[PDB]
Amino acid sequence: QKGKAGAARIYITRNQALKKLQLTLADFRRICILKGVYPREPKNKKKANKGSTAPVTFYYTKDIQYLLHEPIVQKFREYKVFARKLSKALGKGELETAKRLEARKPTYSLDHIIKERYPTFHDALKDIDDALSMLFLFSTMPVTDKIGAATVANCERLCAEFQHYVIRSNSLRKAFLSIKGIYYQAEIFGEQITWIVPYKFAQSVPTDVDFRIMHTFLEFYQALMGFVNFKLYNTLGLRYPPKIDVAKSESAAGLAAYELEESNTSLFSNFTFFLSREVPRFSLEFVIRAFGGKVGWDPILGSGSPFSESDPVITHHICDRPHISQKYEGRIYIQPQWVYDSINKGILERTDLYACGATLPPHLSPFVK
Amino acid sequence: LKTFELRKQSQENLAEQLQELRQELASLRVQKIAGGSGSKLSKIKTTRKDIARILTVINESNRLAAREAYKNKKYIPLDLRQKKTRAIRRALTPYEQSRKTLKQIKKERYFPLRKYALKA
Amino acid sequence: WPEYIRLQRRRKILNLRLKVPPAIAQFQKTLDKNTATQVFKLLNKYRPETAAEKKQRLVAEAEAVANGKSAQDVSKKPYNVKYGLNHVVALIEAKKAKLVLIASDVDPIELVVFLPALCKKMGVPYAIVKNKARLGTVIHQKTAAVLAVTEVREEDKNELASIVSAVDANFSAKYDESRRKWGGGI
Amino acid sequence: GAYKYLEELAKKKQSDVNLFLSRVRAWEYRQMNVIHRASRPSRPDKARRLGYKAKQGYVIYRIRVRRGQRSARCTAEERVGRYCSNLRVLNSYWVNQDATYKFFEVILVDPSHKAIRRDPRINWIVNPVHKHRESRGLTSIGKKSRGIGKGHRFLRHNTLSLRRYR
Amino acid sequence: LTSEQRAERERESQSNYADHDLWAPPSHEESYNPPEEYPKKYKSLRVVPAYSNLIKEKFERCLDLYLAPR
RNA sequence: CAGAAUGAAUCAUCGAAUCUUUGAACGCACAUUGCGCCUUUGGGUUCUACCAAAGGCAUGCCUGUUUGAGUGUCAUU
RNA sequence: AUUGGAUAUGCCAUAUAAAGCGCUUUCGAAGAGUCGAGUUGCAGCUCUAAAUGGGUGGUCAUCUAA
RNA sequence: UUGACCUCAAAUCAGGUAGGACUACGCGCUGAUAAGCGCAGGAAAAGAAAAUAACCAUGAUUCCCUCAGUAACGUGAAGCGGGAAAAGCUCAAAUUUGAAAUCUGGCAACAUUUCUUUUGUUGUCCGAGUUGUAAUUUCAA
């Protein structure tokens, strides 16, 4: 008698995984982003689906039963109880118990779910690209209903800490200014990691990406950004998390706000470059700090600039605007295409090639070979 | 084997000491159907008793490590409870036995049975 | 149908098809929607303090005493609505209550069946409102049976003299013959 | 309180109010089980007077009995006490009847509940001598049945007493 | 703990961001002025618009790891 | 009797443990002999197979927790 | 070695409290299909109370059930 | 759409609980006391008067002697008196209303033990409870 073992034993359906775990669709999709499980296709799906021929998603039983002992599943159901205690409080007009329970809103911990799925920190370094990219993704858009306004500050703090620690360790090696934005390819603790960052533009809601699924996926990426910061700052001797200057944050100093206090990397180190209010100086200062160069900026570009527009210490006062009426002597106005090529070629690129009012060359991919 | 110096080594060291003590006994019953000396039937006796010492030892290194595990706990399993008598486990405790109202607390701090005497 | 639902619609209808005595007949004619939204608006100032935040003011009262300060000498007599069946029967017999509120769904109906007769005799203006649980929400309870205002402060006395006049004029002034005839048998 | 009014009302058992609730509740009590748990006592005054405090551990049951030869109230104490093997019986009173069934309720107390056991007004029933009181005729109506009272109304000779010196 | 202590011992908490250590395709040479093919060619970085498909692309890649098989 | 000898003792006491299958007998049926289900672990170079081990699966009732159902009672500008 | 009620003594306690008895220009709540009568083998069935009332005994004495 | 509340369910949910054996002695059930049925403890039943008495009054219950083979109708008491032992009381019914003052449970600390096996205290969060949990009172008042 078939229908007891073979493929149909280890392989089981999506609906059956709802029956054997006692969850719903929105409950099942909620947890398998934090915990890594993806559908697995049999080599023969008719035998595995107990003779039927419908198109049906399939799962190992060794992971769907490994899901049973997870105490985070208890936190979700004990989040169901809370809102049916808060609505009991809010629905009976008692405002004060409605305030007293939201502070003790039950929150699970993301410690033991990052323990088992990423064993090695180097393996965690290998899978830190998409999480950091997502950390750099939602950190510049407006506040969304399903997205967390407080988590937006976490997205701002985690990416800056990733920017400050990499700049302190000079981990960034390759950088390309592609059509999408500035793709930064770094290498920390041996693992070479590439992260793509877009330009700060007037974005709009796409009305098609599930922000509910995004808020869950961002929460899975919020732990890895901090845990790596807990590891990288300990590796570099800095504070995890580093002390952040709110006054410099209110003045938009970037990595200068998050003070990294201790608890060819010199391609442009001998070049104190300044900037006007014509380009994305946030990544420009990150590229300069990763390459050892002193980064200046205009007051409109942001406060905390070590070098001003009138400062004669500007080695290469790069201006994205081709018309630089205040181009100082010794601060020749160049374009970011030369600096991007300088980050690509690893040497001091020709500022006369990609100058302000000069032809920018074709920027190839730094990761390409 | 002297049971006081069995407890001076960890649990796993009692572990590999367990089977070859059996493999001696497992081999020693083969000689009974083979036929041998009479002093090994004394060795039959003292290998079972030596089997029956380490098993006493290892079991008391599990339960005594469980008791240190279940300190301070409101609930402990059944096998570590009292086994006195069913009528003793399910009867009142002297706390609840000696619980009084507030009325019989007042009536025995202003009016207790004092000690007195007479004179014959 | 399940084993219990076919009872749950039938005891709904046997209260209708039978002869309701005039004592019980008044327990279905009930204060309306409108005038039962201002009574609970006046009461929602005089709720009893929630047991969690009575303690909150008690730790703030007992911390200054542990230093030497006090507030018992300047503590004015408190206010709230008065609830509980046995405390409100004695608040009517002593002519202390001024507005008695009777739930319309007390399960053993004998618990409140003497109250519209006691309120008629002692001269305490009364009304029968819906949903015992609605009273329960007022006083932080699951199911209340009755409430009573016995003393509002000088702030709402002028409001209370008006809202009672809505209670007599709609419940007591009306409903005067349906309480004097049998009900049910529909 | 309300229990004064609810005692004198519960005596006028045949009057129009006490008869209307009799017909109504006998209907609901009859479609329910022969023994089914209450959630509140139907007579919350008689229950309060016979011993029932409204705390955890006090369980109200109610049971119909066929009319028409042990006293019916006594069997309502026994049949509920055989349906609940843990609960200790306190009392059992009359709540309703009709031409074919008498309805009673019973007050039952959990002896294992650590709220009865911590309370010195009901702690006499945790003791093991009170095991199945309704069996031994040791309760409110099992005492009245067997003529245990005070009054001329309600082997000690059949053995010869042969002393040592006689 | 008194009434002020009811307040200030709630305030050192709720700061939980990794306070202990748990560990004890590429670009196709596409840019503003890519001359390999003639997407589009952008003369100036300020003239380059915003590629709005990145939100739908990154979400699709995120949803592929959890819903699409592998 | 042999037996080892030199903490012996079919010793005494006894507070920690062991207690086979049954039996109120309790995962199901029986008188043997079986039939199963759930979770965990291990095994033999596969948890696509197989086996084993370990922990659970009687009923009634009580207290509490979670999930619900009710053309059962109502409120929601 | 476990355990008893004590004696003395040390530290705690929280007492803004609780209790005995005078004194009352004041009040004083008391258990129901039970009691009770009729009637079949203390039970069954029919009926069904009251507040100086109700019970049992010689107008009195004595008690306070459900 | 939503939210309370009532009722009813479901859970290998959390913690508990009931059977069965002995039955000399105890208490009930029917019963030709015998047999059968049920139910407990080291004792149990009984118990602080809806009791006697007709006195100059006695004073919960139990048991022995006596009353006594007596009254009353072959059956067969009881009051009084004499002993042993003596311990009394707890609720319902009155509003804590100037404040549900009450309690189970979950978690965490502190102890503590016939005992790492026992038994609690304190803090905290639900929950029970105004259809009434504590204080007060039981007619002797």
UniProtKB/Swiss-Prot annotation, chain B:
Pfam families, sorted: Ribosomal_L29
Subunit note: Component of the large ribosomal subunit (LSU). Mature yeast ribosomes consist of a small (40S) and a large (60S) subunit. The 40S small subunit contains 1 molecule of ribosomal RNA (18S rRNA) and at least 33 different proteins. The large 60S subunit contains 3 rRNA molecules (25S, 5.8S and 5S rRNA) and at least 46 different proteins. uL29 is associated with the polypeptide exit tunnel.
Primary location recorded for the protein, binned into one broad class: cytoplasm
Record gene name: rpl35
Name of the protein in its database record: Large ribosomal subunit protein uL29
Phosphoserine modification, residue list: S10
Stretch forming the signal peptide: none
Single GO term (MF): mRNA binding
Entry keywords, A to Z: Cytoplasm, Nucleus, Phosphoprotein, Ribonucleoprotein, Ribosomal protein
Subcellular location: Cytoplasm; Nucleus, Nucleolus
Domain of life assignment: Eukaryota
Function: Component of the ribosome, a large ribonucleoprotein complex responsible for the synthesis of proteins in the cell. The small ribosomal subunit (SSU) binds messenger RNAs (mRNAs) and translates the encoded message by selecting cognate aminoacyl-transfer RNA (tRNA) molecules. The large subunit (LSU) contains the ribosomal catalytic site termed the peptidyl transferase center (PTC), which catalyzes the formation of peptide bonds, thereby polymerizing the amino acids delivered by tRNAs into a polypeptide chain.
GO cellular component term of the entry, any: preribosome
SUPFAM superfamilies linked to this entry: Ribosomal protein L29 (L29p)
Similarity section: Belongs to the universal ribosomal protein uL29 family.
UniProtKB/Swiss-Prot annotation, chain C:
Signal peptide interval: none
Gene: rpl8
Lineage: Eukaryota, Fungi, Dikarya, Ascomycota, Taphrinomycotina
UniProt protein name: Large ribosomal subunit protein eL8
Molecular function GO labels: RNA binding; structural constituent of ribosome
Keyword Glycoprotein in record: no
Subunit structure: Component of the large ribosomal subunit (LSU). Mature yeast ribosomes consist of a small (40S) and a large (60S) subunit. The 40S small subunit contains 1 molecule of ribosomal RNA (18S rRNA) and at least 33 different proteins. The large 60S subunit contains 3 rRNA molecules (25S, 5.8S and 5S rRNA) and at least 46 different proteins.
Function as written in the Swiss-Prot or TrEMBL entry: Component of the ribosome, a large ribonucleoprotein complex responsible for the synthesis of proteins in the cell. The small ribosomal subunit (SSU) binds messenger RNAs (mRNAs) and translates the encoded message by selecting cognate aminoacyl-transfer RNA (tRNA) molecules. The large subunit (LSU) contains the ribosomal catalytic site termed the peptidyl transferase center (PTC), which catalyzes the formation of peptide bonds, thereby polymerizing the amino acids delivered by tRNAs into a polypeptide chain.
Family that this chain belongs to: Belongs to the eukaryotic ribosomal protein eL8 family.
Main location: cytoplasm
Annotated organism of origin: Schizosaccharomyces pombe (strain 972 / ATCC 24843) (Fission yeast)
BP GO terms, sorted: cytoplasmic translation; maturation of LSU-rRNA
UniProtKB/Swiss-Prot annotation, chain D:
Biased composition (Basic residues): 143-153
Gene Ontology cellular-component annotations: cytosolic large ribosomal subunit; nucleolus; nucleus; preribosome
Annotated GO MF terms: RNA binding; structural constituent of ribosome
Domain of life (superkingdom): Eukaryota
Location in the cell: Cytoplasm; Nucleus; Nucleus, Nucleolus
GO BP, sorted A to Z: cytoplasmic translation
Keywords: Cytoplasm, Nucleus, Ribonucleoprotein, Ribosomal protein
Region annotation (Disordered) ranges: 135-154
NCBIfam families assigned: PRK04243.1 (NF003269)
Protein family per UniProt: Belongs to the eukaryotic ribosomal protein eL15 family.
Other information: There are 2 genes for eL15 in S.pombe.
Protein name: Large ribosomal subunit protein eL15A
Record lineage: Eukaryota, Fungi, Dikarya, Ascomycota, Taphrinomycotina
Curated annotation (Swiss-Prot), chain E:
UniProt biased composition (Basic and acidic residues): 5-23
Encoding gene per record: erb1
Top-level lineage group: Eukaryota
Organism of origin: Schizosaccharomyces pombe (strain 972 / ATCC 24843)
Region (Disordered): 4-36
Protein purpose: Component of the NOP7 complex, which is required for maturation of the 25S and 5.8S ribosomal RNAs and formation of the 60S ribosome.
Biological classification of the source: Eukaryota, Fungi, Dikarya, Ascomycota, Taphrinomycotina
Cell compartments where the protein resides: Nucleus, Nucleolus; Nucleus, Nucleoplasm
Protein's recorded name: Ribosome biogenesis protein erb1
Description of how the protein assembles with itself and partners: Component of the NOP7 complex, composed of erb1, ppp1/nop7 and ytm1/SPAC890.04c. The complex is held together by erb1, which interacts with ppp1/nop7 via its N-terminal domain and with ytm1/SPAC890.04c via a high-affinity interaction between the seven-bladed beta-propeller domains of the 2 proteins. The NOP7 complex associates with the 66S pre-ribosome.
Range of the intact protein held here: 248 to 345 of 740
Family (UniProt): Belongs to the WD repeat BOP1/ERB1 family.
Disulphide-bridged cysteine pairs: none
